[PDB]
Symmetry: C2
């Protein structure tokens, strides 16, 4: 892969939960886009179950004709940070979900995945 962020999305796209989980450092956090904190902090032990959930949601939206698009990661001037823009589109192209992840890396592992999404409210 071109980077550990590329590896994470490539594993996910493959359904390799274990491969994606291994992209995270043992002290990593996933800062979810919704929750009381605001957002929600998931530690590495808690992340694997999130990846299982996401794999089954991915297959369910695909069966409805939806298309999940993850843009190529763009690194910041700080090379240990990068953003990944993403969206969910109906089959014709309409966007129903859109967000961005801010990654923090350390020593080739993901240390923070900070997830944001538009509120279609």
């Amino acid at each position: 892969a071109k980077s550990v962020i590329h590896q994470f999305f490539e594993s996910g796209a493959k359904g390799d939960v274990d491969g994606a989980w291994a992209c995270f450092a043992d002290d990593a956090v996933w800062l979810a886009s919704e929750g009381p904190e605001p957002g929600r902090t998931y530690t590495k032990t808690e992340i694997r179950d999130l990846l299982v959930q996401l794999d089954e949601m991915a297959r369910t939206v695909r069966a409805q004709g939806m298309d999940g698009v993850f843009e190529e990661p763009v690194f910041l001037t700080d090379p240990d940070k990068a953003v990944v823009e993403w969206s969910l589109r109906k089959a014709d192209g309409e966007v129903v979900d859109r967000g961005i992840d801010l990654f923090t890396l350390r020593d080739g592992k993901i240390l923070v995945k900070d997830v944001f999404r538009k509120a279609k409210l």
Copy 2:
């Protein structure tokens, strides 16, 4: 300022709506965190009222010990794009709101301000 992004947050914090507005290109869009799009698109003519609404929003949080923090922009490898992380916090430090802006700049003006915020919830399902 050290960039038009620095200028924008300097002028907004002063309540200088006109100065903050002038940071936007005439064809700029402010993509708000919430709406049906998802998010909500504001063109430059609609941004000024948003800036006034936000200006009286700031007074009401200011008038309650709440402080907003806007981090220095960090640019992408595309030097016309940058992220600004931000947070609103109570006096005692509790985080009330937190988000990130993705800026697209062009010819020294803001072309896109793409706003994302964490959703404060007990749970999503």
